Amino acid sequence: DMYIERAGDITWEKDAEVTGNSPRLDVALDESGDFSLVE
């Protein structure tokens, strides 16, 4: 039995921690909603 609990407001934060790269990937999406890499 699943239940929900509030965790916060949805807002943009000034001076948030900035990280992560920006990869450009060739991908395929199957009928089950799974992504896979195309090579």
Partner: protein, 156 residues
């Protein structure tokens, strides 16, 4: 039930203790999450019940109480923020410049941030605080790191 707009954890008590299986967005009286988090099951909010209204396994999305309401899109140029809600941890904003998933049916923004599976459904926002999609359906690349699509629905 609580129907105030915002980000919510999706929990279950079926397993050991109380386990966070994902996250979602309440907007305009509709709850939005990824299909793999709930498998389309009904949800509880206090003493109230939220019934599924629309869902699609291939998009990996589901809405409750009404149709999908989120329609903002990544501009393809700017940094966005993941409002990560990890299991047992406070909501925290992470800023990043999305990469891109190139598919035979068009390009989709993607974020290269790695959180536990129970973070699925956390919203990705633009600089106006609009939800441009949900985090949690993606791929594992060469180096073993996770990259999520920015998954967005269609507002009828």
């Amino acid at each position: 039930g609580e129907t105030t707009d915002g980000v919510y954890r999706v929990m279950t008590r079926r397993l050991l203790g109380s386990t966070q299986v994902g996250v979602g967005v309440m907007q305009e009286g509709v709850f939005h999450t990824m299909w793999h988090v709930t498998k389309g099951a009904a949800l509880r909010s206090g003493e109230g019940r939220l019934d599924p209204y629309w869902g699609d396994v291939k998009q990996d999305l589901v809405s409750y109480c009404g149709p999908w309401k989120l329609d903002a899109a990544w501009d393809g140029l700017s940094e966005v923020q993941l409002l990560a809600v990890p299991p047992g941890e406070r909501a925290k904003n992470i800023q990043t410049l999305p990469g891109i998933f190139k598919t035979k049916d068009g390009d989709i923004g993607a974020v290269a941030l790695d959180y536990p599976a129970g973070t699925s459904g956390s919203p990705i926002l633009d600089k106006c605080g609009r939800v441009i999609g949900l985090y949690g359906n993606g791929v594992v690349i060469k180096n073993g790191s996770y990259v999520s699509a920015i998954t967005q629905g269609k507002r009828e």
